[PDB]
Subunit: 80 residues, 2 copies
């Protein structure tokens, strides 16, 4: 892309690599761009369950939901 | 929220589907809803080095759309 904004982010990328690593690379050109729109909610649940033998345990769940799509997915399920 | 209680029921139901643990939802005790909204940009970039010589790198920049925020996620040579 020759979109001026994409070039500006690419420069930002190089400049950030330079300040993170002290690399002194110079931006020459942007030879490829792919944009990935992300729009969702990450839900964080602490939840009480009834285990196999009747035991009451605590779990932390992470659900990722896309808001302009029909997509929910459990990311993580973890004891507390 | 009662839809938060609904996502949780799914979360437990999903775990059981995927592990077969047959845990049963009792009660929802904490909730937090984190809105994520932005663009992940993937760039192949040509740079000049010290000194000199040109070279390709692949970069990833996360950018928030409703906030003034951009961040370098990744910066790596192509092989």
């Amino acid at each position: 892309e020759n979109d001026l904004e994409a070039i500006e982010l690419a420069r930002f990328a190089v400049a950030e690599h330079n300040s993170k690593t002290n690399a002194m690379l110079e931006f020459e050109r942007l030879v490829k761009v792919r944009h990935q729109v992300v729009a969702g909610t990450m839900h964080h649940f602490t939840v009480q369950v009834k285990e196999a033998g009747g035991g009451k345990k605590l779990y932390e769940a992470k659900v990722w939901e896309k808001v302009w799509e029909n997509f929910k997915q459990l990311q993580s399920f973890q004891p507390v």
